Amino acid sequence: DLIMDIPVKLTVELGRTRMTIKELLRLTQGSVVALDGLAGEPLDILINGYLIAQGEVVVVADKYGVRITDIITPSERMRRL
């Protein structure tokens, strides 16, 4: 079926971390928290919270975008949960 004009929401996550209530509250103005992902890693392209693609960051005429390098394989989907 080609009911296919439907629009979708695309997001890009720079990084993630697991972190608890106390140091949440301890975070203040100008507080910086390091991300789990090491610099240069391809970011995560999510669809409604669902990942299908990975890609690095890029700027296209002052506009944000990602250069995708891997999109489709679920063989690694087991570890990211």
String of DSSP letters for 44-63: EEEETTEEEEEEEEEEETTE
For residues 67 and 23, what is the distance between their CA atoms, to the nearest angstrom?
34
Q: Which residues bind another protein (CB under 8 A)?
A: 1, 3-41, 43, 47-50, 52-53, 55-72, 74, 78, 81
Q: Which residue has the tokens 């990942």?
A: 51
Q: Which of residues 20-59 bind a second copy (CB under 8 A)?
A: 20-22, 24-25, 27-35, 37-40, 43, 45, 47-50, 52-53, 55, 57-59
Task: Give yes or no for residue 2 binding a second copy (CB under 8 A).
Answer: yes
Give CA separation, 28 vs 31, 32, 36, in Å. Answer: 5, 9, 20
In the complex, the residues that contact a second copy under the rule CB under 8 A are 1-22, 24-25, 27-35, 37-40, 43, 45, 47-50, 52-53, 55, 57-69, 71-72, 74-75, 77-79, 81
